Amino acid sequence: ARPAFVNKLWSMVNDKSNEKFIHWSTSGESIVVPNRERFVQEVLPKYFKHSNFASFVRQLNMYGWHKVQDVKSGSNDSRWEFENERHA
Fold it and tell me: What is the annotated quaternary arrangement, including any partners?
C-alpha cells in the first residue's frame, strides 16, 4: 500500500492551510519550503508527532526528492526546494 510518509506528504502539500509553509511550485514540478524554521515549527508537528527536518529530508531522499546544491560554498540556507530524480 502507499507508505504512510507519502500519504502524509501528499496531504500536507495539497492542504491550502499549509500554503505559507510548503507548496507545489506554480509549474507543479517541485515542492517548495520557503523557510525551514517556520515549516518545522508550524507544519511538521501536524503530521509527525515527534520528528525533525533531518528525518523529513531523509524520507524525501528515499522517494527521489532532492534539494539540488547549486550554490557555491561561501558564495540564505533556509529555503528548500525539492526536485525529483524521476522524469517523464
Answer: Homotrimer. Homotrimerization increases the affinity of HSF1 to DNA.
Q: Nine-digit cell at 83?
A: 526536485
What is residue 50's three-state secondary structure? coil
Given the candidates 1.10.10.10, 3.40.50.2000, 3.30.70.380, 2.40.128.270, the CATH classification of the domain at 1-88 is: 1.10.10.10
**Cα 53 from Cα 59, distance rounded (Å):** 10
- Read off the C-alpha cell for 42: 508550524
Contact (CB, 8 A) for 59 and 10? no
Resolution (Å) of this entry: 1.8
Structural method:
X-ray
Measured between alpha carbons, how far is 12 from 77 in angstroms, rounded to an integer?
22
Segment 9-15 long-range contacts (CB within 8 Å, at least 24 positions apart): 9/59, 9/60, 11/47, 12/43, 12/46, 12/47
